[PDB]
Amino acid sequence: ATCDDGRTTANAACCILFPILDDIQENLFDGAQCGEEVHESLRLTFHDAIGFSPTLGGGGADGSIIAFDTIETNFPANAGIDEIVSAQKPFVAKHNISAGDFIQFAGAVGVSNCPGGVRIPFFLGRPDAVAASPDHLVPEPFDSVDSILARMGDAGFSPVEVVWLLASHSIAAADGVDPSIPGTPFDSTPEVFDSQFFIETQLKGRLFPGTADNKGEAQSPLQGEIRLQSDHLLARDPQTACEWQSMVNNQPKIQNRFAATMSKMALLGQDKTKLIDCSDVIPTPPALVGAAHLPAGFSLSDVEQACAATPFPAL
Numbered sequence: 560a561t562c563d564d565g566r567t568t569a570n571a572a573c574c575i576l577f578p579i580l581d582d583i584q585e586n587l588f589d590g591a592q593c594g595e596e597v598h599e600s601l602r603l604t605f606h607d608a609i610g611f612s613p614t615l616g617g618g619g620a621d622g623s624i625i626a627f628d629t630i631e632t633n634f635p636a637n638a639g640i641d642e643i644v645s646a647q648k649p650f651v652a653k654h655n656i657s658a659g660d661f662i663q664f665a666g667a668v669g670v671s672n673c674p675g676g677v678r679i680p681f682f683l684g685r686p687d688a689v690a691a692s693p694d695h696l697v698p699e700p701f702d703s704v705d706s707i708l709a710r711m712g713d714a715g716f717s718p719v720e721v722v723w724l725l726a727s728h729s730i731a732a733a734d735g736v737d738p739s740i741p742g743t744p745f746d747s748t749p750e751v752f753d754s755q756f757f758i759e760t761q762l763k764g765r766l767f768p769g770t771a772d773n774k775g776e777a778q779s780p781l782q783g784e785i786r787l788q789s790d791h792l793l794a795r796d797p798q799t800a801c802e803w804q805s806m807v808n809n810q811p812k813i814q815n816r817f818a819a820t821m822s823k824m825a826l827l828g829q830d831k832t833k834l835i836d837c838s839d840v841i842p843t844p845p846a847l848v849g850a851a852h853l854p855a856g857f858s859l860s861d862v863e864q865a866c867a868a869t870p871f872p873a874l
C-alpha cells in the first residue's frame with residue numbers, strides 16, 4: 560500500500576500510523592532522541608502489559624494504565640509512571656488509536672531511536688481496556704529472584720525470557736530508587752542498546768552512588784551508575800546467571816531475543832490473528848559502532864563470575 564503522503568506499508572490499515580509516528584518523534588521524543596522519554600515509554604509498555612494474571616484478571620497490554628490511571632498509578636510499583644502517562648494521554652485523545660496500541664507503538668518507535676536497537680514487531684487494533692489491572696502484579700527491585708520469576712512465569716515468561724526482557728535496562732535510569740541522584744543509569748551507556756548492562760551488573764559492588772539505605776538498591780560498581788538489588792541477584796542466581804552472562808558481547812542474541820520477547824509482551828491479553836501487522840512502520844534503528852568492554856581499569860578479577868559451565872569472556 561501507498562499512504563496518502565506517499566510512504567508505503569504492507570497493509571493499508573497501517574497508514575493511519577504515519578502521522579502518529581511523526582507527532583511522537585517530534586512531540587513525545589523531543590526530535591527522535593534516545594533519551595528519558597523513550598526510556599519511560601519503554602518502561603510503560605511493561606507496567607501496562609504485566610497487569611495480566613490468569614487467576615486474578617487484567618487485560619495485559621490494553622492501555623489500562625492510561626484508561627484507569629487513577630487506580631493503577633496508586634500502586635507503589637507504578638511510582639513515577641504518572642509523568643509518562645500524563646504525557647502520552649493527549650496523543651491518544653488526539654489520534655484515532657486505542658491506548659493499548661499507542662503505548663506499544665510509542666515503545667517500539669522509541670527503541671528504534673537507540674543505536675543497537677531493534678524494530679519490535681507491532682500489531683494494530685487492540686480494543687479499549689475494559690478493566691483496571693489487579694493490584695500487586697508488577698515486580699519490584701526488592702523482590703526475591705523466586706518472587707520475580709514466579710510473577711513473570713504466571714504472565715507467561717520463562718526465566719530466560721525475563722533475562723532477555725531485562726536488556727531494557729541497557730537504556731534506563733532511576734529517579735525514585737535514590738531520589739537524591741535522579742537520572743542515574745543502570746549501565747554506562749543509557750542511550751545505547753548494548754550488552755553493557757549485562758557486563759556491569761556482574762562486577763563486584765563497590766559503593767552507593769547517592770545514599771546508602773535505599774530499599775531495592777544494591778552497591779554499584781561505579782560512581783555514575785545505580786544497581787537494583789533484583790538485577791544484582793538475577794545476574795548471580797543459578798536460575799538465571801548463565802543466561803545473563805550469555806548476553807555479554809552477544810548483541811545478535813540481545814537483538815533477536817528482545818524483539819521476539821517484547822512482541823510476546825506487547826501481545827499479552829491480545830490475539831495477533833485479530834490484529835493487523837504494522838511492523839514495517841517502525842523506523843530502522845542505528846547500529847552499534849563500539850565494542851563491548853569492561854569499564855576502563857577493571858579486569859576479570861572485578862567480575863563475580865556466576866556461571867559454573869562457562870567462564871565469563873575476555874573483553
Ligand code: HEM
Binds near residue numbers: 598601707725
Ligand atoms: C523483572 C523485573 C523488573 C524490575 C524489578 C524492574 C525495576 C525497575 C526500577 C526500580 C526502575 C527504576 C524506576 C525509577 O526509580 O525511576 C526501572 C526502570 C526501567 N525499567 Fe525495569 N524492572 C523490571 C523489568 C523491566 C522490563 C521487563 C522492562 C521492559 C520494558 C523494563 C523497562 C525499564 C526501563 C526502560 C526503565 C528506565 C525508565 C527511565 O529511564 O525513565 N523493566 N525498572
Ligand SMILES: [Ca+2]
Binds near residue numbers: 606607609618
Ligand atoms: Ca494493562
Ligand SMILES: [Ca+2]
Binds near residue numbers: 755
Ligand atoms: Ca546501554
